[PDB]
RNA sequence: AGGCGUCGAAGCCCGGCCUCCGGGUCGGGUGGAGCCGUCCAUGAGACACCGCCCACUCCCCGCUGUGUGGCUAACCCCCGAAAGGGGGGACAGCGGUAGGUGGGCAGUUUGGCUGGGGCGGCACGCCUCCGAAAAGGUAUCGGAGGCGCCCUAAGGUCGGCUCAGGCGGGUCAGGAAUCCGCCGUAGAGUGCAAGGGCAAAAGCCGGCCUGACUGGACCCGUAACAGAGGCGGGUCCAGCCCCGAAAGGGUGGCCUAGCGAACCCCUGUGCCUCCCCGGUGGGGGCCAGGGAUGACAGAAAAGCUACCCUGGGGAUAACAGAGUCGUCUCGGGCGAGAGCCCAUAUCGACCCCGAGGCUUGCUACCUCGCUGUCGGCUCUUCCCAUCCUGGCCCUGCAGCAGGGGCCAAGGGUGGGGGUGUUCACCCAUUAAAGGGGAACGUGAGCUGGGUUUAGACCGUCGUGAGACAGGUCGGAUGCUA
RNA sequence: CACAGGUCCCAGCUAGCCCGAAAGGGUUUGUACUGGGGCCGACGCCUGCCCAGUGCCGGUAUGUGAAGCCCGGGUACAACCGGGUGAAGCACCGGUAAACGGCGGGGGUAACUAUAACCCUCUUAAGGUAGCGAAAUUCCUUGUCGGUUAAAUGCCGACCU
RNA sequence: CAGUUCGCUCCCGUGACCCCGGGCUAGGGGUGAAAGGCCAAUCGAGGCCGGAGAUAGCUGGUUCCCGCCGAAUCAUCCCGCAGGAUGGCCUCCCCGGAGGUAGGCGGUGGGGUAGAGCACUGAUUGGAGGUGCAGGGGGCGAAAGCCCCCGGCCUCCUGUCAAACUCCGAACCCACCGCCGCCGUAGAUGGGGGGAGUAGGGUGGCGGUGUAAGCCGUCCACCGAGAGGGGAACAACCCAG
RNA sequence: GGUUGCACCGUCCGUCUUGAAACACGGGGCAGGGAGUUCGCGGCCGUGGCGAGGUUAAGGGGGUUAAGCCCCGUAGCCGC
RNA sequence: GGGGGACCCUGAGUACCGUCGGUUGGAUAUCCGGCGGGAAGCUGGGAGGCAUCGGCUCCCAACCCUAAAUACGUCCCGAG
């Protein structure tokens, strides 16, 4: 599907309809300073079997779109509803 | 599983131990202090068959 | 835009030098006073001068490691009670840590439904039609199909128009290119299955837009009655907006499919919080969006057992019984015909109606705290749908014989070859050498050749353990009624 | 099953293989005519092709590759992030089948009848050579022919589908 | 006689031979001329004591009497299918205080089954008429095309169909209202709390499926959980609780 | 009351199971023994005390042959 | 027995840091052990639940001993 690069929509911070740029969330790796990762590293040490499930090749054919819309007037970003599943996502100047 | 013959041999049981009491004895040279810088003369007394050597021994 | 020049310059000669040998740098000396643009070219101008670099390389000092060669003094190996001698050597050995390899050794897993189980299939998550019995609900490995997407337009609104097919007439132009007229209830189209809905539209053609948005309430469905995490849908309040003159509509696709808990992690945003207090780095918490578990209400996960073991199950298969008779055996109705004429001496197509439980199958009703298998031997008994013996009828019955049928179950129906065989085939006789039931009669009567444990070989399949309704050799038969 | 015989593999000694937590130890009072590890199995004649796969061995220019170390950022110090160095092992290359295993498949002919391989087309690492064959291997099968019997799902000989 | 013995028959019997006393190898271990054989009547991991009264959704058992009421084997979820949880059905106690509806009559609405029918969608025998209609078969013509037969497509007549067809359409069922009847102040409808059992049903009528038996649902009548009187005995059939 | 006769009726007991006289399992006789116990937490009920308050725990004193009996004990817990 | 000092003393492979294994409710914040490092030391040092800086509060390790209140019953008295 083709999606506009800019859309005029409501801005929660400006409390009015402004121009928002469309951007996609980039999935960063796990942080080693988080409590969950600290617990995982602590329990992985020493003798014993693997303590967590190990899923292999588990993923949906197509995934939902995690989009953020950033207001061009205030510079803050927000979300618009739930994601939708399309295999092809093309941002166009339309 | 069970052990192999090679594995059982390493434990030194009488099934695998060499019977080193029916043999004529170890064949080693005289200590090197006698041989160094000096020449010794000996006489052959007897030639015998060592049970396990694959070679005759002499006194 | 001047800088160099006794703070010594062009033009002449050889020497070393790097070098795309382009052509530049430089010691000495004949040399004793000149050298470049600025001007134009160059995509970007000065070998005018003053600065920092960037591309390769070398060398002077210091730092760092990696490898190589040598040494003995740690350490080790040998000889010797010892003294000491010899060999190796900062390796090896030992201690700590890091990655790989690793069925040598372990703990485990290898799902479920299933007209037994296995293989197969998924009825294991959803949508439509029939089943389904005119409110609701209703199952089967019931029947017929679809889904795990796609669309910035195929989404919102406003204006205008009417489709498929057919007929008649037209330059190339024909069955089919484009155009005029008429009939035309949708026979078209609506993204995709099916059902339903849509004609001054929900279809086609255009204009303007992003309501496919933010903070919340209530209700229906999955899941009737009648409990529900998650999810889907409907009716609204407020904010900011879109289309329109206005009414009015807009919380995605005309309605019904296109999808997912806990924990953890990533992103957005603006608040709370971290042990006596304060600042900083970092962490934790609240709200929103996303990464998936298809066995789809969400374990991470391969097999053999014939050396097998345990708890059970007639909730469930093999032998046998029971129900049924598709199949099997045996009949019947009609008569196209074949028989020199003649349907019925004999055979009887295509169809149709039955009997038996003697073949096989189907169900899973009795029996898994045991009802001992096939075949053979011994012995007893029963049925008739009669093979011979007794008596008859028709004949395409001259006789001798044959073909078909009727009454009749007293008697008989035997001996041998290969094969474990029943059966079937064959041999010599015979009046004939009938088919079946009795827990496929009969192992507290026998035998043990086959089948169906534990040993072993061959062929095929499997990486392997191993397996084969494939062959092959051996392999136990209890008893005082 | 074992066996004498054949052949292959590892090892020059502080070796190779093996027991163990370690210390120490078995082979070993041993030294390649030896010690240890597979497979076949007297004797006679022989033992053909294939290294693409799975194993094992040698190399490893090059890529990846953990900790440690070094450099930059960050932290008034660390946690944390990016880069360089980077052994073994994999990737890659070569030997190896008396290592595990494998050794195929369609058309037409030479019609001096008919039917055979000389022959031409896909195809792999290669297409089963000498032998033996209805075999303890053959489903059809009680294959077909010959001998054995009066009679042969047996037995022997032969053919090869 | 014996928890592996006896008789006949058979095999080795100078060798890898048979037997005795002293020793060593101990359980994931020993030993094995390899059968998973042997290791004190025990071996695909010995025996003794301990963990230990281990665990099981699987089998068995569970002790006096009378009185009152009295089920279920049906839906959703679970590596769930011989087991559990939430509901449905039973029982006991309490609050609250005037309505409630299993049956019937009339009314206001809803439905598409049986039957029937061809008006859509798809099948279906023959005939007649129209249409050259892009079809085929012949004759026929240099070529522009004709003449018939057959075929296709429409209309009519004639003879037949539909679980996944409907221009029609019952019996019947459901929702609501008024009334009759019945229940209720000796307390119903409803609400709160305590305790369960039930997750194999069977026969019978109806529906899908199957040659049939049977399998799967549905109806709630009978057995299950039910005496007595009958069908000769009978779970289910009749009278009757 | 013991035994027996006649007429009619009556296929044992426990158990899983839709279905038991069962050719489904447990059943020679008799006597004794034999199976919902204890603690901790929680829900609920019957009754009793006090009541915007309720109650003590460990422990202490008095008395007693004695561990019985009498008084104290506000820490703590629940509620407001 | 009290005041002052400007001199001296007050525990080292230890405290602590990194990493690894075990253990713990101890969670970036328990304790023990191995390996590689490793101080100050009176003008000194440590703790205050992630790490560091400032304040404030408390304390002085790396040496030793210590009755009573406690745990048990091979034994005894007494009791149910
Ligand atoms: Zn804004």
Swiss-Prot record, chain A:
Keywords: Metal-binding, Ribonucleoprotein, Ribosomal protein, RNA-binding, rRNA-binding, Zinc, Zinc-finger
Cofactor binding annotation: Binds 1 zinc ion per subunit.
Residues where Zn(2+) binds: 11, 14, 71, 74
Zinc finger (C4-type): 11-74
Cofactor(s) the protein requires to work: Zn(2+)
Superkingdom assignment: Archaea
Record carries keyword DNA repair: no
Family annotation (InterPro entries): Ribosomal_eL44 (IPR000552), Ribosomal_LSU_eL42 (IPR053708), Ribosomal_zn-bd (IPR011332)
GO biological process, one term: translation
This protein's record includes keyword rRNA-binding: yes
One of the record's GO cellular component terms: ribonucleoprotein complex
One Pfam family cited in the UniProt record for this chain: Ribosomal_L44
GO MF assignments: large ribosomal subunit rRNA binding; structural constituent of ribosome; zinc ion binding
Self-association and partners: Part of the 50S ribosomal subunit.
Family: Belongs to the eukaryotic ribosomal protein eL42 family.
Function: Binds to the 23S rRNA.
Identification of the protein by name: Large ribosomal subunit protein eL42
Lineage start: Archaea, Methanobacteriati, Methanobacteriota, Thermococci, Thermococcales
The gene coding this protein: rpl44e
From Swiss-Prot, chain B:
UniProt entry keywords in alphabetical sequence: Ribonucleoprotein, Ribosomal protein, RNA-binding, rRNA-binding
GO molecular function: rRNA binding; structural constituent of ribosome
Residue span of region Disordered: 1-20
GO cellular component, one term: cytosolic large ribosomal subunit
GO biological process: cytoplasmic translation
Its biological purpose: One of the primary rRNA binding proteins. Required for association of the 30S and 50S subunits to form the 70S ribosome, for tRNA binding and peptide bond formation. It has been suggested to have peptidyltransferase activity; this is somewhat controversial. Makes several contacts with the 16S rRNA in the 70S ribosome.
Subunit annotation: Part of the 50S ribosomal subunit. Forms a bridge to the 30S subunit in the 70S ribosome.
Family: Belongs to the universal ribosomal protein uL2 family.
Name of the protein in its database record: Large ribosomal subunit protein uL2
Organism name: Pyrococcus furiosus (strain ATCC 43587 / DSM 3638 / JCM 8422 / Vc1)
């Amino acid at each position: 599907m083709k999606y506009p690069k800019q859309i005029r929509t409501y801005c929660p911070f400006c409390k009015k309809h402004t121009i928002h740029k469309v951007e996609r969330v980039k999935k960063r790796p796990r942080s080693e300073l988080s409590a969950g990762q600290r617990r995982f590293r602590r329990i992985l040490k020493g003798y014993g079997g693997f303590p967590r499930p190990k899923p292999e090749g588990r993923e949906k054919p197509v995934k939902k779109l995690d989009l953020r819309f950033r207001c061009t007037e205030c510079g803050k970003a927000h979300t618009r509803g739930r994601g939708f599943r399309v295999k092809k996502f093309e941002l166009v100047e339309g | 599983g069970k052990s192999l013959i090679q594995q059982r041999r390493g434990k030194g049981s009488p099934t695998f131990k060499s019977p080193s009491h029916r043999f004529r004895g170890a064949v080693k040279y005289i200590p090197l202090n006698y041989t160094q810088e000096k020449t010794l003369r000996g006489v052959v007394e007897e030639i015998m068959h060592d049970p396990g050597r694959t070679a005759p021994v002499a006194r």
